[PDB]
Write a protein that binds this ligand. Structure first.
Ligand SMILES: C/C=C\C/C=C\C/C=C/C/C=C/CCCC(=O)O[C@H](COC(=O)CCCCCCCCCCCCC)COP(=O)(O)O[C@H]1[C@H](O)[C@@H](O)[C@H](OP(=O)(O)O)[C@@H](O)[C@H]1O
Ligand SMILES: CC(C)CCC[C@@H](C)[C@H]1CC[C@H]2[C@@H]3CC=C4C[C@@H](OC(=O)CCC(=O)O)CC[C@]4(C)[C@H]3CC[C@]12C
Ligand SMILES: CC(C)CCC[C@@H](C)[C@H]1CC[C@H]2[C@@H]3CC=C4C[C@@H](OC(=O)CCC(=O)O)CC[C@]4(C)[C@H]3CC[C@]12C
Ligand SMILES: CCN(CC)C(=O)[C@@H]1C=C2c3cccc4[nH]cc(c34)C[C@H]2N(C)C1
Lengths: 286, 57, 336, 235
């Protein structure tokens, strides 16, 4: 019955924890992996590890047992950690996009003004936004319906709070990431565009290869972010405003929640397990 | 390049007039040096950590 | 002219004399020796702080303080026992490819793509290191320098010529000419009267410091020699080259005794030194590994893996307690 | 351990480490360029063109390596001239691994001239051989090359006087500055075996004060941007 779901959630959590811990350890003990971009990739891995070791076990226990058997206080701590660690992960993706945009568009600041202090500041802002999204519900904005059911762990359904949290956790990061990666896509195309016939043909094949590569990479990043987090936040924005006539199946809600959770497992693959330097460092470790 | 040829041939003839010993004697003199100083070689025979300056004071 | 005829006649005479003096190979003489066996060395200290490739290091006579040179234009005096940076000398030219630490411990020399050997006074009244003298006169990059004394230093540069300097005056007391290619390495005999230099013409020459002429020439390698080091006895020396082979030459036998090569190594040797007793021959390779060779057996006794880019410098303490290998990975490792 | 001398030694080590880290951070903010070329290949002209009003961001003359430090548009450049190193390059060419770009200077007017070592050796052919050797080293497989074609007016006068067929027997075209210059630029670019990894930026050195330095700045910024794009997986 629930043994199959228990095994599936356990292996998902184990894979996420192992991948994030491997990325963090590789950045910690490797000396070439000690720059601003890899610092941001390590902070994202740390946030995903926190997601996988603090939120995912409790979410799986809630899913397997089909009820909350940990207490209302522990339910509030779960909701706070879930929103804080996941908003931090999304805002880490946004900060990585911003750092890439600055590195590609502004080589002068890349050479001169780019320091690890910038990475630390970006991480601090991502965690600060996560706190500003997850803490205010712990202090007010709590209708009695939240604690009205002891055998449940549901987020606040207040329209103002749902708008604030859902927008400032996904939609502002989503719009910012889309704009930044569109500008990066424009800059990359501009850089790619700029017997004799054989050399011209070789250059043209090279240009199309690079264009396909940049389209594939940006598609991978943006599609992973979208398919992992967009389905959940659409439902999180629509259902609070639809008190009735919008009954939510438990299966689909759990699926969109665990897509959001599995974003933390997919992030190390997208940002760490693809670039050459991380692969070389992991092979050197092994 | 004839002036340097005289210097080169003088160098070769000065090198060719040195006294040389048998290779067996040289090998024996290297063996004797290696075996006489083997007990005094920390790298060849591992030293205990008590008097190893790089492990314990 | 016709001088080539008697030149090759003298070459043939030298070869015939060397063959006549060769009665038994070193392996046959040393066959009855029991093997030194597999040797276990682990990194004991990892000196950190260099931010570029390390090209040279040199141990002190006290076997505790070592100097390292790297492309970031720094000359760091380490304390290997406690991993403490005693000094960090900023170099005027960041292109440094050699360094030496004086036997008295008072001075440190370095040189590189700039053709100047800079002498730094470590022990001064104010406690701040200053450039004592800048030795100029070479027309090629300084490859190696060794403090012959507290006032004399012998240099080798990429102008095919080794020189003997007087630090007090700053002039070349003696210039050693005869090499056909760039001189890459230099080693002083323990008696402080002779030195050998391995050059890019695939030959090593023995020089008389006082008399200033080449006593002997050893031509066994098939490529340029990158490293040279006397046997602790002082009657032999080992040479490392890009031929991926190490060769033990004997001064008295005036020829090669042993070849240290393996089928699994095809990368050149960048550094060579002997153990305190001379039984171990330690060589740094371009495959970021150091192979410990049984100098009397031509059998590998151990591998000092642990570097990432390329072991470029390597030296053994005078007391022989430990061996330090610096690499292009910007890390110096004490092995012991 | 708790002794005063040990504490003082560790404090001095920490201070030295802090100074080293500060110096390394300061040095990482500099763009390093390697300047190469033949003997009378206009390297000195390019260097002097760089040093006009902006420089420096009992010493003994080096004559081995010369460092030119200039700043253009808030970018710090260090250009290393190794013309005075009369020795085997392979024993020190690896010291320059990791430079942002290589400024290879070749004079267009030396196609007619020949080297003094032997008459049957064109100076332009020697420059092409040097370019081929330096463009395909195992150390500079990732390093872009900024090619400067100096002496354009002298080249124009020479080709108006002497044809280009002497330097290139396979050349077949009108003796005009545009066509001959394009042919020489294509011959130098065809020596790039690492087409997929590195790019060659060619500029004809001009008497205008800031155009050559502007070209170097544009090439360096393009190299940095493309390196960032490659790291991001977009190039
Ligand atoms: C219709 C037409 C065309 C389209 C149709 C088909 C073709 C394309 C389909 C879509 C692509 C899907 C995924 C492709 C994965 C793939 O091929 O990955 C390549 C090699 O990986 C492996 O060999 C194996 C993967 C990594 C190794 C395993 C990692 C560990 C997994 C478990 C982790 C948890 C347990 C430890 C590497 O990635 P890449 O060569 O595809 O190209 C780029 C990548 O897309 C960029 O994201 C990356 O950017 P970064 O964010 O800075 O890293 C770039 O550096 C670069 O790697
Ligand atoms: C939430 C989880 C379960 C989602 C798992 C699927 C994603 C990894 C998918 C969703 C959209 C996919 C993308 C959709 C389309 C493309 C274009 C495709 O075509 C190209 O090679 C681009 C160049 C060209 O087409 O010319 C390459 C793969 C890519 C980026 C896909 C990569 C994989 C993505 C991100
Ligand atoms: C893109 C890569 C990383 C794969 C990601 C796959 C996940 C999105 C999958 C793997 C296992 C799945 C889970 C397996 C089983 C269940 C139980 C299932 O239970 C029910 O629907 C009935 C009980 C109830 O929910 O009330 C709900 C979905 C859920 C949590 C699934 C949600 C989606 C999960 C986490
Ligand atoms: C019953 C499961 N629960 C209660 C613990 C949720 O609805 C979780 C709450 C979330 C949530 C709300 C509001 C804003 C947000 N940003 C990031 C997340 C977030 C994470 C997100 N997870 C995936 C599901």
């Amino acid at each position: 019955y629930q043994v199959i779901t228990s095994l599936l959630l356990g292996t998902l959590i184990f894979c996420a924890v192992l991948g994030n811990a491997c990325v963090v350890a590789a950045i910690a003990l490797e000396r070439s992996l000690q720059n601003v971009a890899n610092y941001l990739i390590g902070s994202l891995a740390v946030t995903d590890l926190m997601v996988s070791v603090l939120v995912l076990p409790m979410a799986a226990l809630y899913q397997v047992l089909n009820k909350w058997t940990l207490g209302q206080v522990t339910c509030d701590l779960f909701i706070a950690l879930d929103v804080l660690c996941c908003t931090s992960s999304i805002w880490h993706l946004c900060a990585i996009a911003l750092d890439r945009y600055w590195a590609i568009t502004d080589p002068i600041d890349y050479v001169n003004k780019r320091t690890p202090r910038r990475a630390a500041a970006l991480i601090s802002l991502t965690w600060l936004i996560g706190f500003l999204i997850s803490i205010p519900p712990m202090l007010g904005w709590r209708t009695p319906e939240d604690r009205s059911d002891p055998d449940a762990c549901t987020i606040s359904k207040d329209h103002g709070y749902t708008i604030y949290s859902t927008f400032g956790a996904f939609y502002i990061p989503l719009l910012l990431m889309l704009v930044l990666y569109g500008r990066i896509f424009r800059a990359a195309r501009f850089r790619i565009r700029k017997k004799n016939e054989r050399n011209a043909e070789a250059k043209r094949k090279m240009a199309l290869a690079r264009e396909r590569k940049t389209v594939k990479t940006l598609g991978i990043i943006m599609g992973t972010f979208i398919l992992c987090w967009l389905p959940f936040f659409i439902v999180a924005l629509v259902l609070p405003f639809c008190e009735s006539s919008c009954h939510m199946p438990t299966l689909l809600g759990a699926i969109i929640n665990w897509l959001g959770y599995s974003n933390s497992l997919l992030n190390p693959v997208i940002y760490a397990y693809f670039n050459k330097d991380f692969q070389n460092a992991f092979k050197k470790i092994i | 390049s004839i002036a340097q040829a005289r210097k080169l041939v003088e160098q070769l003839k000065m090198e060719a007039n040195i006294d040389r010993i048998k290779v067996s004697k040289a090998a024996a003199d290297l063996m004797a040096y290696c075996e006489a100083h083997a007990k005094e070689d920390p790298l060849l025979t591992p030293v205990p950590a008590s008097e190893n300056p790089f492990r314990e004071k | 002219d016709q001088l080539r005829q008697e030149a090759e006649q003298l070459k043939n005479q030298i070869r015939d004399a060397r063959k006549a003096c060769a009665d038994a190979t070193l392996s046959q003489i040393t066959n009855n020796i029991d093997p030194v066996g597999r040797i276990q060395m682990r990194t004991r200290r990892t000196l950190r702080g260099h931010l570029a490739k390390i090209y040279a290091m040199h141990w002190g006579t006290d076997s505790r303080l070592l100097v390292s040179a790297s492309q970031d234009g720094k000359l760091i005096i380490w304390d290997s026992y406690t991993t403490n940076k005693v000094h960090a000398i900023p170099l005027r030219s960041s292109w440094v490819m050699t360094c030496a630490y004086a036997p008295s411990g008072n001075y440190v020399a370095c040189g590189g793509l700039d053709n100047i050997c800079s002498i730094y006074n470590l022990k001064t009244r104010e406690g701040n290191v200053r450039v004592s003298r800048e030795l100029a006169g070479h027309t090629g990059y300084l490859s190696c320098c060794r403090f012959l004394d507290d006032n004399q230093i012998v240099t080798s540069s990429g102008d095919t010529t080794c020189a003997l300097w007087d630090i007090e005056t700053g002039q070349q007391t003696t210039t050693f000419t005869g090499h056909t290619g760039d001189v890459m390495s230099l080693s002083l005999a323990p008696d402080t009267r002779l030195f050998v230099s391995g050059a890019c013409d695939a030959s090593a020459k023995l020089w008389d410091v006082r008399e200033g002429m080449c006593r002997q020439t050893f031509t066994g390698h098939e490529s340029d020699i990158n490293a040279i080091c006397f046997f602790p006895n002082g009657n032999a020396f080992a040479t490392g080259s890009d031929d991926a082979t190490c060769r033990l030459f004997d001064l008295r036998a005036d020829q090669e005794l042993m070849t240290y090569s393996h089928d699994n190594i095809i990368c050149g040797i960048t550094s060579v030194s002997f153990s305190k007793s001379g039984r171990l021959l330690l060589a740094g390779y371009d495959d970021f590994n150091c192979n410990v060779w049984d100098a009397l057996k031509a059998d590998r006794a151990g591998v000092l893996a642990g570097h990432d880019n390329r072991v470029s410098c390597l030296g053994v303490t005078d007391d022989g307690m430990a061996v330090a290998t610096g690499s292009w990975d910007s890390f110096l490792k004490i092995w012991n | 351990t708790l002794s005063a001398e040990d504490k003082a030694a560790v404090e001095r080590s920490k201070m030295i480490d802090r100074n080293l880290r500060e110096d390394g951070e300061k040095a990482a903010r500099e763009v390093k360029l390697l300047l190469l070329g033949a003997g009378e290949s206009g390297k000195s002209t390019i260097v002097k063109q760089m040093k006009i009003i902006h420089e420096a961001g009992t010493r003994v003359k080096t004559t081995g390596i010369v460092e030119t430090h200039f700043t253009f548009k808030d970018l710090h450049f260090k250009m290393f001239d190794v013309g005075g190193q009369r020795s085997e390059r392979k024993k020190w060419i690896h010291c320059f691994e990791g430079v942002t770009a290589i400024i290879f200077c070749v004079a267009l007017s030396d196609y007619d001239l020949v080297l003094a070592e032997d008459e049957e050796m064109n100076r332009m052919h020697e420059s092409m051989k040097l370019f081929d050797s330096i463009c395909n080293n195992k150390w500079f497989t990732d390093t872009s090359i900024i090619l400067f074609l100096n002496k354009k007016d002298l080249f124009e006068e020479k080709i108006k006087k002497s044809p280009l067929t002497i330097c290139y027997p396979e050349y077949a075209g009108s003796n005009t500055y545009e066509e001959a210059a394009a042919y020489i630029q294509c011959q130098f670019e065809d020596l790039n075996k690492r087409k997929d990894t590195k790019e060659i930026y060619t500029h004809f050195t001009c008497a205008t004060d800031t155009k050559n330095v502007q070209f170097v700045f544009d090439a360096v910024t393009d190299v940095i941007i493309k390196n960032n794009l490659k790291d991001c997986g977009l190039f």
